[PDB]
Design a protein around this nucleic acid. Structure first.
Lengths: 40, 227, 92, 50, 222
DNA sequence: TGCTGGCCCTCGCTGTCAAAATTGCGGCTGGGTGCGCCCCCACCCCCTTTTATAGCCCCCCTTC
RNA sequence: ACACCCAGCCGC
DNA sequence: GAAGGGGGGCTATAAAAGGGGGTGGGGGCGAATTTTGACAGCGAGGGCCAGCA
C-alpha cells in the first residue's frame, strides 16, 4: 500500500516512459518494453 | 423446468456438414404445446378487436379449466379458444356479439354456438343475459357519434325493451334500431348499410325493427334532444 | 424494416398452411397485429435495440428533474466504443 | 439405434459440462427461455461478484 | 453468308457519324412530333480559326440550342444494327462528339422545377386520418372462404366404400403406370376411404423401408 | 584396414498461430422481463332422416 | 414481499 | 340496373343407426492486450552404411 498510494497521484503516460505505465511495465516483467534504453 | 441451447459462438462446435451438433430438443409434452398454441391464438385473436389484457387472462383461465376438465377433446382447440373468449367478454360486463368473434376467428357461427353451449353445460357456470345497453357505446363510438346521440339511443333501447314492443326480438336488432333512431334525427345521418356493417344484422332485420318500432316515437325519446 | 420482414414471413407461413389444403384464405386474420404493435413497444420500453447481442441502452427514461436536464437529455448523443475499455484517443 | 445413443450421450456430455463450466469456447452457452445465459459454477465463484 | 455475319461495308467506306447528347425536353418534343418530317435546323459556321455549332428548334415544334464539341480520341466508337431478319450490319464509326445545351440561363430552372413536379408525382407519402377506421373486422356470420369450402364439401361428397374387385382393378391399373406410390397419392387417385384402402392393400401390398424420405408401401403382391 | 559421402532418424529454433484469462472501490436510484416439422394412431363428430317452434338472413324476383 | 438485466447518477 | 320485396334455408331440441373424415396424441428426423502453449517447417546434426583405397 505504501508503494501503490504513490501511484494515484502522478500522471498517466526526450525521455523514457514514466508513470503508471512504467509501474505496470516494471512489476510485470514485460518481455517487450515500449521504450527500452541504455546509459553508456 | 427446461433450458434452451443457443447458437454456437466458436466454430469448434460445427460438424463437417455444419448444423453445430448441439440444438434444443423442445419436447415439453404435448398438452403444454397445445396450451401454448392456444394462448398464442387467443392473444392474436383478442389483439385484432383490441381487448384489454384482463379479458385475455380471464380467457386463459377459462381455457385452462376447460382443458383440465377433460370433456371437450372432440372439438377443435380453436373453437374452445373462441368460446372462452366469448365467455370472458360476457363475464366482464362488456359482451361482444357472436359475429364480432366470428370476424376475428377462422370458425363458423354454428360451431362457436355449439361450443359455447357445451362450455356452459360442462364447466357449470352461469352467465348474465345480455341487455341492449352494453352494445350501445361501442356501436356509437365506432360509428363516430357524439354523447347526446349515445344517451338518446340508450334511452330509446331501454324504453323499447321495458315497454314491450319487441317480443322475442334479438337485442342486437333493437340496439341497431335505436342507433338508427338516434341517427335519423340529427345533422349526421347513417345509411342502413353502415348500420348493418357495424352491427352485423342484415338490412331486412333493420327494416323489420324500424317498421315495428316506428309507432309511439316521441315517448321513446328522452326529455331533450334538440330535434 | 426487420419487423415488417417478420410480419411478411408470418403471413407467408399462414397463407401456405391454408393454401396447401386447397382453399382461399381471409386476409384479415392472416396479418398478426401482435408483431409490430409489441416489438416497437418492447424496444422502446427495454432499450435493447433488437429482437433480444444487439445494442443496449438506446432508449432511456426521460430525466424529469429540471428543465435543463430534460433539454440536455433530449439533445444527447452516444458513442458505441466499449465504455469499460481503457482507451484514450476517441474520448478526447 | 447406436447413433441415437451416441447423440444423446453427447447431449448429456454438453449438459453436464455447461453445469460445471459455461464460459469455455466452442459449445453454445446454455440459456433459459428469453435470453439470460444461466449462471454456472464458474459464474458463481470467479470474478468481482463471485 | 450466315445468320451471325455482320455486314462491314460501312466500315470499309470509312463513313463518319456524329454522336450527340441532348437534354430530355428536346427528346420529348421530338417524340411529340411523331416524325412529321422536320424538327429543326442544324447550323454550322466556321471562322478563320474557330468553329460554331448550333441547333434551332422548329417554330411549329415549340408551340437556340448551342452545341459544344468534345474530345473523341480517347475511345473508338462504332455503330452496328440488328434487323428483324437477323442480318447484322455496321453503320459506321463515330468521328466527332458534341453535346446540346439550352440557351435559356435563368428561366430554364423554372422548367426544371416543373419537371421536378412531374417527377415528384409518382413518389407517394403517408397521410393522416382524422377518424379511426370503421370497416375493419366487420361482424360476419361466416367467412367467404369458409362458406365456399363448406359448400364445396356438399356436392363432391364423401368417398363411398366400393367393392373389392373394382378397387383392385384400379390399384393394379395405377401400378401399371408407375412402380412406387405414396399413400396420400393412392388415396387421391383411387378416391377411396383411407382406412378401407389401407385394409385392402394390407393383404397384397407390403411396406418397404426407404431412408431417403419415409417408410412407404409396395403394390406388388410379392 | 582406415577413410568417404549418401540418406535415415532425431532434435529443436522459430514463425505464426490457438487458447484463455483479466480489465478500481464504495453507493444511491428507476425501469423491464420473468429450432422446424411430418407422419401414424385412437377417439369423437357429423354425415342422414323426421318434426315442432321463430327470428334471422341469403337468394332470387320484381318494381320502376 | 423478489431475482436477473439495463440505464442514470455520487465521491475519489 | 339500383332498390325493395317475397320465399325459403339456417339456426337448435331430442334420438337412433354405420361409417368417413376431422381432430388431437405419441413417436421419429436433422472495441481492446497480454502470457502460456502447440502445430508445423525448415534446417542441421550424429549416426549408419556401401563403397574406395
Amino acid at each position: 500500500q505504501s508503494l501503490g498510494e504513490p501511484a494515484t497521484q502522478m500522471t498517466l503516460n526526450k525521455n523514457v516512459t514514466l508513470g503508471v505505465p512504467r509501474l505496470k511495465e516494471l512489476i510485470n516483467i514485460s518481455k517487450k518494453p515500449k521504450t527500452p534504453s541504455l546509459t553508456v | 423446468l427446461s433450458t434452451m441451447i443457443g447458437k454456437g459462438t466458436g466454430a469448434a462446435s460445427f460438424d463437417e456438414f455444419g448444423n453445430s451438433k448441439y440444438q434444443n430438443r423442445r419436447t415439453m409434452s404435448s398438452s403444454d404445446r397445445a396450451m401454448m398454441n392456444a394462448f398464442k391464438e387467443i392473444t392474436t385473436m383478442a389483439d385484432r378487436i383490441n381487448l384489454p389484457r384482463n379479458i385475455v387472462d380471464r380467457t386463459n383461465n377459462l381455457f385452462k379449466q376447460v382443458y383440465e376438465q377433460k370433456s371437450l377433446k372432440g372439438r377443435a382447440n380453436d373453437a374452445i379458444a373462441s368460446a372462452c373468449l366469448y365467455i370472458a367478454c360476457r363475464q366482464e360486463g362488456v359482451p361482444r356479439t357472436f359475429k364480432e368473434i366470428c370476424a376475428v376467428s377462422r370458425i363458423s357461427k354454428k360451431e362457436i354456438g355449439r361450443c359455447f353451449k357445451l362450455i356452459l353445460k360442462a364447466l357449470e357456470t352461469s352467465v348474465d343475459l345480455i341487455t341492449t345497453g352494453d352494445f350501445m357505446s361501442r356501436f356509437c363510438s365506432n360509428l363516430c357519434l357524439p354523447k347526446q346521440v349515445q344517451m338518446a339511443a340508450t334511452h330509446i333501447a331501454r324504453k323499447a325493451v321495458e315497454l314491450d314492443l319487441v317480443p322475442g326480438r334479438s337485442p342486437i336488432s333493437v340496439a341497431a334500431a335505436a342507433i338508427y333512431m338516434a341517427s335519423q334525427a340529427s345533422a349526421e345521418k347513417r345509411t342502413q348499410k353502415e348500420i348493418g356493417d357495424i352491427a352485423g344484422v342484415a338490412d331486412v332485420t333493420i327494416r323489420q325493427s324500424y317498421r315495428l318500432i316506428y309507432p309511439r316515437a316521441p315517448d321513446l325519446f328522452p326529455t331533450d334532444f334538440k330535434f | 424494416r426487420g419487423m415488417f420482414k417478420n410480419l411478411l414471413k408470418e403471413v407467408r407461413i399462414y397463407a401456405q398452411k391454408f393454401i396447401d389444403r386447397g382453399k382461399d384464405f381471409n386476409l384479415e386474420l392472416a396479418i398478426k397485429t401482435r408483431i409490430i404493435s409489441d416489438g416497437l413497444k418492447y424496444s422502446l420500453a427495454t432499450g435493447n435495440w433488437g429482437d433480444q447481442q444487439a445494442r443496449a441502452g438506446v432508449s432511456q427514461v426521460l430525466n424529469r428533474l429540471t428543465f435543463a436536464s430534460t433539454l440536455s437529455h433530449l439533445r444527447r448523443l452516444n458513442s458505441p466504443i466499449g465504455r469499460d475499455g481503457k482507451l484514450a484517443k476517441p474520448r478526447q | 439405434a447406436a447413433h441415437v445413443i451416441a447423440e444423446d450421450v453427447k447431449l448429456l456430455q454438453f449438459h453436464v459440462a455447461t453445469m460445471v463450466d459455461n464460459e469455455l469456447p466452442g459449445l453454445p452457452r446454455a440459456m433459459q427461455k428469453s435470453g439470460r445465459p444461466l449462471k454456472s459454477l464458474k459464474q458463481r465463484l470467479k470474478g468481482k461478484e463471485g | 453468308a450466315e445468320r451471325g455475319e455482320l455486314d462491314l461495308t460501312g466500315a470499309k467506306q470509312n463513313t463518319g457519324v456524329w454522336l450527340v447528347k441532348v437534354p430530355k425536353y428536346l427528346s420529348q418534343q421530338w417524340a411529340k412530333a411523331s416524325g412529321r418530317g422536320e424538327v429543326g435546323k442544324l447550323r454550322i459556321a466556321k471562322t478563320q480559326g474557330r468553329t460554331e455549332v448550333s441547333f434551332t428548334l422548329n417554330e411549329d415544334l415549340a408551340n437556340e440550342h448551342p452545341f459544344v464539341l468534345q474530345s473523341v480520341g480517347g475511345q473508338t466508337l462504332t455503330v452496328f444494327t440488328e434487323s428483324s431478319s437477323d442480318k447484322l450490319s455496321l453503320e459506321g464509326i463515330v468521328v466527332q462528339r458534341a453535346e446540346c445545351r439550352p440557351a435559356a440561363s435563368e428561366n430554364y430552372m423554372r422548367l426544371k422545377r416543373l419537371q421536378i413536379e412531374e417527377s415528384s408525382k409518382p413518389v407517394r407519402l403517408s397521410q393522416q386520418l382524422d377518424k379511426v377506421v370503421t370497416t375493419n373486422y366487420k361482424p360476419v356470420a361466416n367467412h367467404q372462404y369458409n362458406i365456399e369450402y363448406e359448400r364445396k364439401k356438399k356436392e363432391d361428397g364423401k368417398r363411398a366404400r366400393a367393392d373389392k374387385q373394382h378397387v383392385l382393378d384400379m390399384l393394379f391399373s395405377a401400378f401399371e403406370k408407375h412402380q412406387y406410390y405414396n399413400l396420400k397419392d393412392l388415396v387421391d387417385i383411387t378416391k377411396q376411404p383411407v382406412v378401407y384402402l389401407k385394409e385392402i392393400l394390407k393383404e397384397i401390398g407390403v411396406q418397404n423401408v426407404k431412408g431417403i424420405h419415409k417408410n412407404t408401401w409396395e403394390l406388388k403382391p410379392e
